[PDB]
């Protein structure tokens, strides 16, 4: 299959992990009922800026892209629109035996080739060209040393990219996190006591906060990941996928965490392969009612939903489920995992 | 389908001294399940049907405050409970806050204490509807009626 589906159930203690311009908890109406929400961008940032990400994705081995090795395939690809003089001049001034090439690299380099061609036509060179294109070159260089970050998460907010081909979507897609149950949020009426004020406090306020059993969903386009890694292998893509699983299972937005401290890990992590990526959010369309907590009924509802619809929805294919609870499991079609690591290794070996 | 609240009111009103005395000394709504006189009181008003059970527990508690504490007075909507509590002029606003913020069973105790203090004149079937539902909306409405009246 081409897609990796990652499903996570994770329970948070009383906190406020994502708010709006009125400092109110982000929410969403699902199944006619209010669910507390953690926005996709907040979750994905929580991943992308994390230390784990920086160590395993940021400092990856396929990180650096060498323009040297890319000379030939570039030479043909752009060879139809540009001639080898301009191509090699461009490549050499940028840098100062590869099979395929990442599309955004081809695009940006092609733009640079347009620029140097138009630079030769007008009759110009030297520090003139190298001052007009100083910032641009700096940009493309910094990006050329961040290939895995760009392949997985997409180009940064301020990238320097200049072509339609340089609009790099991430390989991973992260849905908004929503609670599996209805939530009426709590209010914290707080005071700020002045050490110089005898009567009363110096400030008064309220803070909205709530517990919640969240359902995170994310999927990974393997093909696109390989292709954006310069034609890497399925296995390397599966390593990256392993990392994504880990982060989606452990990483939590730092919003309001200094004071509410909801540092909780996932109680359930499932991964399955498919040709069509699907969210199991409809397992909670009818809001989960609490029976000795919201966690167990949530996992149970997830399992029952999968058992009901997985066959018809064409979700046949490799599927593993790491879990901390002892709730009745899924169909036997899903391979049970006792540690997260065994699940990640299950992912490494193509399922 | 809907509880005849006035019939329950008159029923409670012309109840013998004994049965009444037995229902009155209850200290929380669920304890009314221990009193036979309670069942004999609420049986004609649909007690053997659960929804009615909860509603009737609340109603009969509030009435158990005493025979002469809730004065029914016909419509000229009619005097709501919040309005009545304010009209008494005995109840502090903070207590109304503490009432509408309270949780299950505690809310009924505090309400009965308030009723005992104010001795409110109100449209009883109205308050009966309120007690039937008693969601968060009803409690907020209670508070806001009370405030607007003062």
């Amino acid at each position: 299959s081409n897609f990796i589906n990652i499903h996570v159930l994770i329970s948070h203690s009383p906190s406020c992990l994502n708010r709006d311009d009125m400092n109110m908890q982000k929410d969403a109406i699902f199944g006619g009922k209010r669910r507390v929400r953690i926005s996709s961008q907040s979750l994905k940032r929580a991943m992308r800026k994390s230390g784990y990400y920086a160590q395993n994705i940021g400092e990856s081995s396929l990180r650096t892209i060498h323009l040297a090795q890319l000379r030939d395939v570039l030479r043909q690809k752009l060879g139809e629109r540009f001639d080898q003089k301009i191509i090699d001049k461009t490549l050499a001034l940028l840098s100062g035996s590869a099979d395929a090439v990442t599309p955004w690299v081809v695009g940006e380099i092609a733009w640079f080739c347009e620029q140097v061609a138009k630079a030769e036509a007008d009759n110009l060179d030297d520090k003139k060209l190298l001052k007009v294109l100083k910032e641009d070159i700096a940009a493309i260089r910094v990006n050329l040393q961040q290939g895995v970050d760009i392949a997985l998460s997409g180009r940064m907010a301020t990238s320097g990219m200049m072509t339609e081909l340089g609009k790099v979507d991430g390989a991973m897609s992260i849905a908004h996190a929503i609670t599996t149950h209805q939530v009426d949020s709590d209010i914290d009426w707080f005071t700020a006591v002045d050490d110089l004020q005898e009567q009363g406090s110096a400030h008064l306020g309220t803070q909205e906060f709530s517990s919640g059993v969240f359902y995170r969903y994310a999927n990974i386009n393997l093909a696109q990941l390989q292709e954006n890694l310069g034609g890497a292998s399925r296995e390397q893509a599966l390593e990256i996928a392993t990392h994504v699983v880990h982060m989606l299972a452990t990483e939590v937005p730092g919003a309001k965490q200094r004071t509410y401290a909801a540092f909780n890990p996932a109680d359930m992590v499932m991964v399955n392969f498919s040709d069509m990526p699907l969210s199991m959010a409809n397992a909670f369309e009818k809001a989960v009612k609490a029976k000795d907590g919201f966690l167990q009924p949530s996992i149970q509802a997830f399992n029952q939903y999968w058992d009901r619809v997985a066959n018809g929805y064409g979700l046949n294919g490799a599927a593993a489920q790491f879990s901390l609870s002892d709730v009745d499991p899924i169909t036997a079609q899903v391979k049970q995992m006792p540690t997260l690591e065994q699940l990640k290794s299950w992912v490494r070996n193509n399922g | 389908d809907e509880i005849d609240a006035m019939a329950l009111y008159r029923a409670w009103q012309q109840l013998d001294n004994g049965s009444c005395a037995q229902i009155r000394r209850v200290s929380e709504p669920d304890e009314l399940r221990d009193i036979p006189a309670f069942y004999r009181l609420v049986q004609p008003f649909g007690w053997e049907n659960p929804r009615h059970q909860q509603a009737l527990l609340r109603m009969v508690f509030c009435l158990s405050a005493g025979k002469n504490v809730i004065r029914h007075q016909d419509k000229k909507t009619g005097i709501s409970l919040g309005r009545a509590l304010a009209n008494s002029g005995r109840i502090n606003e903070r207590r109304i806050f503490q009432l509408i913020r309270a949780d299950r069973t505690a809310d009924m105790v505090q309400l009965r204490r308030l009723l005992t203090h104010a001795e409110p004149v109100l449209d009883w079937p109205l308050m009966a509807r309120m007690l039937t539902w008693w969601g968060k909306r009803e409690r907020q409405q209670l508070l806001e009626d009370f405030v607007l009246t003062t």
Binding site: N2, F3, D20, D21, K26, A28, I29, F30, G31, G32, S39, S40, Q41, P103, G107, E135, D136, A138, A139, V142, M156, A157, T158, S159, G160, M162, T163, E164, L165, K167, D169, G170, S173, I174, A175, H176, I178, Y217, N219, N221, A223, Q224, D275, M276, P277, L278, S279, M280, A281, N282, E285, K286, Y313, G314 | -
Partner: protein
């Protein structure tokens, strides 16, 4: 009778655009023509610079969208709207270089409890065949989503295939029936029209020309 390809666009949140050049990213009630062309274009492996096959898809396919009310426990659930306060840290200050703003703001609208059923057919001079479109929606190359990448699908894109006279009958074959149908092809007893600016000007990247749906109400 012609061959139709029936799709399903369901998920907790969706986003179907309206004209904008601002931080506000608005949503319509039902999928936009350009949004659908983009969904299909994502199922196929079409890059953003491949204007050729982009235009081929645009000139091969026409749509018909039906709005499906969510029924839960015999009770109807109406489609709500959602406003997302979406900020961006270190956003590009200009279209080149590396200078950036500390924080910038956007406001993005989503549809909640929304689900649609799309009927798809071929123009008289189309290039592709509904078979390969079926293969595409069964095994997409790029990740398909409902407007925005943060909007996953909870039901498989493929719903079915059938033959029929008009899109209304084709859609009649698939529950839940009764939703309002907005089609690019007229239908006899119906004359209403829904103007919109979602016909993607392709030769002019990211631009939009005017067009009109044929509005056909449900019983």
């Amino acid at each position: 009778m012609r061959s139709y390809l029936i799709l399903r666009l369901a998920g907790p949140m969706q986003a179907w655009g309206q004209p904008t050049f601002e931080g506000t990213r608005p949503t319509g009630r039902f999928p936009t023509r350009s949004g659908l062309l983009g969904l299909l274009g994502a199922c196929l492996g079409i890059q953003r610079d491949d204007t050729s096959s982009l235009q081929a898809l645009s000139e091969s396919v026409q749509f018909a969208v039906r709005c499906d009310e969510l029924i839960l426990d015999d009770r109807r659930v109406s489609v709500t709207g959602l406003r997302d306060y979406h900020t961006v840290l270190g956003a590009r200050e200009d279209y080149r270089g590396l200078k950036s703003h500390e924080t910038i703001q956007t406001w993005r609208e989503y549809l909640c409890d929304a689900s649609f059923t799309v009927a798809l057919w071929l123009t008289p001079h189309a290039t592709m065949v509904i078979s390969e479109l079926e293969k595409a929606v069964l095994k997409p190359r790029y990740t398909p989503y409902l407007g925005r990448r943060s909007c996953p699908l909870t039901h498989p894109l493929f719903l079915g295939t059938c033959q029929a006279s008009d899109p209304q009958k084709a859609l009649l074959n698939y529950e839940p029936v009764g939703g309002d149908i907005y089609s690019e092809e007229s239908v006899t007893g119906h004359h209403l029209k829904f103007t919109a600016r979602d016909e993607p000007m392709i030769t002019l990247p990211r631009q939009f020309a005017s067009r009109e749906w044929y509005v056909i109400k449900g019983g």
